[PDB]
Amino acid sequence: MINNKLIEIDNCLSAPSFFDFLKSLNVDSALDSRDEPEFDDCWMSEFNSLDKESFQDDDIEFIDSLREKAFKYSFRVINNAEISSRISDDIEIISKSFVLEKENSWSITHLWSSYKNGKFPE
């Protein structure tokens, strides 16, 4: 079965205007900040830890559908491939963190919380 937390992410991503905040984003400044060591090292630490875990196939398949929604719904707002790519990647690690029930998770308390508060995490 598909993890219920992933269905909740689907509901959030699909909400009207979820990504409209991107209209106010300073794209270059935010991506520059994400490429600096503080953010980049943190993101890669999450990624590397999650890459060692094992996930059910229905969850992986569903996460790929969440990535496609995150990518395309955000692309419709500002048509920026790098932003949409980073959002897709964020949703990948957010989703995996929720499935693992990770507590004190930077992916959830920083990346996902950012999106829920109308901000691109940086």
Binding site: W43, F47, N79, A81, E82, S84, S85, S88
Partner: protein
């Protein structure tokens, strides 16, 4: 300035390499998806790169040769996609309605001409 946000090689992956790019540099040509439903071409490019190069964050764990080879592998089965390759500031136009594979060739040639390999 008109921006697609698609640098090849990607900005993060080029950092520290001869062809490093800074985001303020609007002369470096980028790829612009053409045709109907550009979001899907953009998604297909994203997913192919995610599969071969990996996450957008982090270093590419390989040489300059491997990095260009990685884009060519990622794009090998995307010949139905068409992109323009051009500077956001309009100074250069390298290709119009080309395949993603061809775009990699055009960028490599431009970078060599510019002394950036």
């Amino acid at each position: 300035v008109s921006e697609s946000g698609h640098h090849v090689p990607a900005v993060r992956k080029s950092k520290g390499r001869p062809f490093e790019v800074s985001r303020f540099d609007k002369t470096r040509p980028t790829l612009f998806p053409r045709g109907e439903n550009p979001e899907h071409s953009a998604w297909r490019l994203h997913h192919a790169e995610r599969d071969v190069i990996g996450p957008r964050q982090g270093d590419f764990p390989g040489s300059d040769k491997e990095l260009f080879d990685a884009y060519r592998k990622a794009y090998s089965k995307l010949d139905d996609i068409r992109v323009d390759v051009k500077s956001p500031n309009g100074t250069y136009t390298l290709g119009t309605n080309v395949t993603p594979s061809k775009a990699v060739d055009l960028i490599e040639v431009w970078l060599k001409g510019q002394g950036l390999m």
